[PDB]
């Protein structure tokens with residue numbers, strides 16, 4: 765199985781240094797108001813050695829997964845790029861928002877771990893790359 769490892773090594777070598785290799789949740793923050801929602805604070809590490817924070821709420825995760833399913837899922841009429849996508853924790857219509865967010869920490873950690881282990885054509889999808897890059901608002905915060 766030496767051939768397999770050597771190939772795995774060759775393929776990784778070709779990825780740009782800014783590709784994400786891990787993403788783990790560091791905390792959650794409540795955004796108060798007429799209606800409140802929660803934001804996940806995520807620590808990302810890249811192939812090139814960078815480490816930084818991004819801030820994402822659940823509906824941003826759901827919008828990304830909807831795109832991936834249309835492009836690489838079962839009902840995706842593009843067979844060539846099809847693969848097994850991880851399932852995203854489901855929507856919860858009603859309930860205590862802070863408890864729902866806390867329950868999603870380990871579930872979203874598993875989903876991100878599985879996503880970053882997918883084939884190169886998914887890792888390089890422009891929307892997946894944008895989701896893990898620092899937006900201007902993420903980078904102007906002091907960790």
Ligand SMILES: CCCC(=O)OC[C@@H](COP(=O)(O)O[C@@H]1[C@H](O)[C@H](OP(=O)(O)O)[C@@H](O)[C@H](O)[C@H]1O)OC(=O)CCC
Nearest residue numbers: 800801802820821822823824826854855856857858864
């Ligand atoms: C007739 C009544 C139908 C009905 O209740 O629809 C409601 C929505 C479901 O509501 P959504 O807003 O699409 O979905 C909610 C957001 O994803 C929210 O994200 P965040 O934490 O970042 O705020 C999650 O926390 C909630 O658990 C989830 O339910 O459904 C859709 O948007 C599909 C269109 C029908």
